[model samples]
Target chain A: LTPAAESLNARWRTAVVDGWNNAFSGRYPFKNVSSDASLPLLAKYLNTDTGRIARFLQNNLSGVLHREGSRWVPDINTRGLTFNPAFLKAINTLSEIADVAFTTGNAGLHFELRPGTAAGVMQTTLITDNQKLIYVNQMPVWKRFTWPADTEAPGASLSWVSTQAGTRQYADLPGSWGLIRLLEMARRKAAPGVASGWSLSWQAQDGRMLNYTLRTEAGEGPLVLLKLRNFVLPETVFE
Target chain B: TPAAESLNARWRTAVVDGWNNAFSGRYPFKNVSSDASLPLLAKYLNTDTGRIARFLQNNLSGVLHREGSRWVPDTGLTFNPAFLKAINTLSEIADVAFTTGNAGLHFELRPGTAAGVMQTTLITDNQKLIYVNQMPVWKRFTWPADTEAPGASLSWVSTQAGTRQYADLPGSWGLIRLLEMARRKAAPGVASGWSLSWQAQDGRMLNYTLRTEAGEGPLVLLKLRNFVLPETVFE
Candidate 1:
């Protein structure tokens, strides 16, 4: 790409992802994710959603929430990086509506997606792996869940969940959740801090997790997965 | 090319008439002949693509070439009388600054008539004399297209974003304004060297250098030297 193209691509990625974080990533499990640090890992996993990722619109929702047709909501509250309760309610809504965006803390890129449905000749195969979760009681728990593709090859679950998503151990009811989506995590690839290889999945309005890539062939990811037309800005933003 | 005026006389006229004609008799405007950032041009680049890199080239059609004892014109455009109108505009009005290694398109302002840190320019196409007193924090102008205006003669005033209608008339666009502003003038006098390193109002001893002209030579040789400048685009 020309410098111009590179700048546009870079800005588009930042605007879309940052806009997403500001609109959704309340309490931000991973510190305020800088643009450079957040983008590559996301490309390896999922880009912005082509279909609506969050079903909540201005027409249906209101108050303290400011996302309308465009995603450039300015000046809400990041609270200098503190956990937000609104995130949970919004996550539930998004999961039920689009399923594109969900998860309590960090585990749910494709939330509640059914396994054993999306597979092909090396596209993917069902595999059982331990996924992490954080219950409302703040218990950091892990459970062996059947993952369709894009899962760790296999290993004993790391016990440091208490540090990242939840700080509690004793709980009333530890629920099933993919900490990968709820918390800021390493990519789903085979190695630590890598892009994914499992031609992964995203949810459809009809309740299906679709695989569009052999995963590796997506080519550095299209700068973003989010459909760009949903975000708009005036030219004065160059400064 | 016969000399109608001495080199000093031409420079004095340029210094006086250029300032008056451009700024409605304003003070503190200086004419520049050359600077340190003049050489490394004509072969500049953004270190990646060839389409983005450009060299300096110009046609001294009716230029004031030094020959015998005359400052005759070569006859390209008529009534183009001011010598350093563009340079004066840059030195007085340009707000932002940019630099390329070894050479650059310079723009700086004098104190008292300078663009404040919060200064903004409100430009419109209707005004004939849009004096740029403040630095332009946001200038919305378009570049001229090729195949017609081949020699970089752009425009000065337009209501909307657009290109110059004609060529060979190097009009003042945002880019040309920046480049012109980047250039500094070094004349025969005022070799005392200037800076803002004096006790600043911030009550701190500052070491900031002020832009001013230095060096002495023929005004003709000073101002009319052929330059191979570079042009870069930021998409």
Candidate 2:
């Protein structure tokens, strides 16, 4: 299967692999997942074997998502008030080709992953700014994920879209830098009077300098959304 | 036979008459009919160790004080092979058109001669040298008086084999024309300086721009100083 996957054109193969690595390989859609979170669960749902994700992973993934075909398909058998399997799948696809070094965004910020250069000789970005600003090959490191809330949450919905909120110590960021895979769960509740949205300040587990707000919004029907803003790290800095 | 019946006899007469007039200082040697048969001209050519030939030959060798066997007549003056060689360069043009191997240096040129002038078409490459009567003809485009400097440097090569017939001209203008003719020989590929905005030139509005493309392959382009066309004048 791996050889078959590699046989595809480099770009397309990269797209598939990176997509899996970026969005699904890590403690995403869950905040409590650790390095040891159930691999059997991952193998059951996302592995190249009998996992439901295997078909989309190996064959005509586009054919499954054409029009509204399976994008709105319920998970197993649930008329859950949410609509976003395609969104998660899309993020999963992007992970396969995540830039190893520099990814740019925001007006002046860029993000970098460790082992920033090519495979083999190991290296990662080092941060030295006042904000404990970490870097690899001059790129800041950050993890993105989306945490799904339990049924009791606002509208049986998922919070935030692919959030890169995770605990990474600037001082102890290991050089391995490859994507990690895991699964975990979280539960939350919203106030009865909260109708529209609100913002919450967040500080990562490691540094006080790296602090920003996580914002959430309540859409038309039973839908709640959350996102991280101003999060892209720049490769260069000006006073 | 009449002069018309025997081509050789007719050419013989023409050569003798032409040489007589030329040596007597009545006409420039370039004006003497080139139509005269080459064999005839060679036959009567001055191998004379006579007083007149000797006198002319001495003057021909006197410029820069060099000595030589052949002499061609100029206005009341004589020139050795050297002087004629230099003049012939001015009369024609040679420009490097392209380059190979080494960059910017050219080993060849696309050649042509000054138009409306009788000039030699002598050309030479490293391995071979050739001289022919037929030469490529060229002309000059004028620029307006208010034109600014081209603000660049350029160079070219030329040969002299043609005739000039003008009098009462300022030596300065003649010198200027001579210099211009030399420049025309190796026209430049670009008129650099000032970033060369074609639209800024009044001539550009009047539909004129320099194009350096001419002749055969393996070419080199000579750089030319900036110039513009003269302002339009209504008839």
Candidate 3:
């Protein structure tokens, strides 16, 4: 789910998705999570088939998700698609996003999964370094609006976030290099909005249409999606 | 407050402490102290990479090995991968300092022969170069220095629009204000001897000096020689 200059949009999406598959998807928080661990976190967002967040995910991310005993899991068929690793990785990351953050005292990370005042329209993901907008997961969804960040609930702060978004008039760390950058930024805790208690937006995960605003502690949120390419691998993050 | 940020914040603090303790000068509200004279204190002075190398070793003992003088990654299964990756990435800041020794891994930082002064003219910073990847705007002044507030300095940002500017910023002690103070105190002139290049803590090349002309370009405060002691000094 990435929106780059039309010239390089698909290439950018491949870069981000490849980062997830080659790097992030292999990490503990993003893979092999126990059903025990997954069940609790998943329950919160997708409690019922009709739940707001669940419905959103179902509508937009239908191809990658499926239900099992009131709980949501990656659609079984998504396992081997040529370009579906991102979907698989998405489920894994979404389910376990908070397990490591809250324990680390970044109490702010939990804010992403927290119920917010708004809902998402498109089923997309945002990746940000917190300073500038980087990439959005869905290009079609991106075209539906312009400069309207006041939608959905607040995601996670940059004290550390390895999610996704886009590059606006700002820099576009094209391809795999950008993905690793997002990872390294999170590793550095040097991403944008260091002191600001801000985060990525997950409003797009739900289906259908409708937008809402999510506020931050001192008021004023429904923050717009922001991003900076970052990722992890041997030379990339380890570099 | 968590992993990488904790290490980063701590490093910034240790560096700034070392900066004020050894070289922040006397005019600013937060001035430098003479702690570098102490045998032990000197090792950890802000200018000394050893100080940061030691702090990182102590902080990441589990993920790293301090068996000898220089630190090395543990490569074991005890630590969390994410945590290891985080520490590995954070540890990059101290890369140049802890990399080599003729006898063994040890700390070494060479004083910049003609390291550029703190003038502002769109420089790729040290922190972002290490962490952000392909992105410029290295480390931010984490703590406030005199009037230089955090995030509000003579901007070093090389924005996506391909625009850049680094000039005198008076109110905030960021590069601008600091640049003004620097020019005011140490007359503006070009200096050159050795060149400067930055590397990740893991030893990958990042950026090198685009221009060596000082007093007109962006360069960090103390561009020590031993940052990446490619060849150990005490040979």
Candidate 4:
């Protein structure tokens, strides 16, 4: 198939698989059993609803990255860059309403996001993004989040977050508290920042125990996943 | 041509009589020439010869006035005898076309009188006689069209703007200024000149008496010449 045809076919397959997995990944066995960051667990994450969430995150993240660079917002608190918070609020509201923005890390560098489900080709998918929140915990986060500022590719992500929503290890939270309608409102109010990917899977109610991966496209490379674990969640799923 | 020359010469010689007679009437109020000529003319008037009488009758009597100066007989409508004699006297000189260059019309004449010889006239129409003597020739008169007389005869093809005159005046700065103004008014690089004539002004005078033989009209002219010239001039 031509690249266009392949893209179309892949998108269809992705929709079908996402629909199949998002419905059942909530009950998949590897998700119910795993509490690891091992390759198998990561593979299980990619093959299920987590993969759909990763795809959805990639879509939103790639779109924000491709936005005209001048509109990218820098976060003062995280010392990292994120989509403007209002925009993040909108996109997160359009999916699932969550308590707070989430965070993750790679080699101790951190970033944050608000993750949620979005209605897509076949089923709902998760997304993670923010806008202009550049610093985290008084650290210089943009350096950790963005790669070579001057010579980076046109659509390179300037931020990454790795912790599952509601994970306490990195002070993660679920998402901006609403759905797609909220994303629309946030989009009207502010712009989005650069993003790479997000993941989701079946989880113990505390959210840190969910299985996930950091998936990217063929030409892309591994990105550092910053962590966030700062939300008040239900007490029933705590450690 | 002979009669015309004689006539012209006669006009020049008349200048002598014109001024002298003007002085007499103007001074004594009487005819100075009536003594010798009046009896001959009266005798010819009474002669039985038809042609002689006719000639005497035709001749202008008052044109050459007689003794009384008050009575001029047989001088009818065609001429004013007293006026003509005065005019003829000033007309006697063959008009000298004086040469002039860039400065002005330089004319010199010998009017055969000592004091009243050089008649520097303001010939341009409407011009007042501004000066004489190297001073202002304070004498002034006008030539109305009705009074068929002559003073300084000047033809000015140029018009005046304000007090500026086309003719050069004599001895006045305004006159020099007028010449300068006229020179500027001429066509580019071209020069023009004016012709002037001499009129005798010899007369008997007291403080206030007027010897106005020189008629105050256009043809009523003034003669400027050497006052005491003893010789008659031909050239």
Better of 2 and 4 by TM-score: 2
Model 1 chain A lDDT-worst window of ten: A102-111
| Number of the top-ranking candidate, with TM-score as the measure | 3
* Model 4 ranges with Cα > 4 A deviation: A1-239, B1-19, B23-144, B147-235
DockQ of each: 0.01, 0.01, 0.01, 0.00
Per-chain TM-score of chain A in candidate 2 equals 0.21
User: Native-vs-model 1 lDDT?
Assistant: 0.25
Q: In order, what lDDT does every prediction score?
A: 0.25, 0.24, 0.28, 0.25
CAPRI-style class, candidate 2: incorrect
lDDT of 1 at B182: 25
lDDT of the structure predicted as candidate 2: 0.24
Across A43-122, the per-residue lDDT of candidate 2 in tens digits comes to 33332222334444335334222323123222322122232344444434322211111011000011221112322212
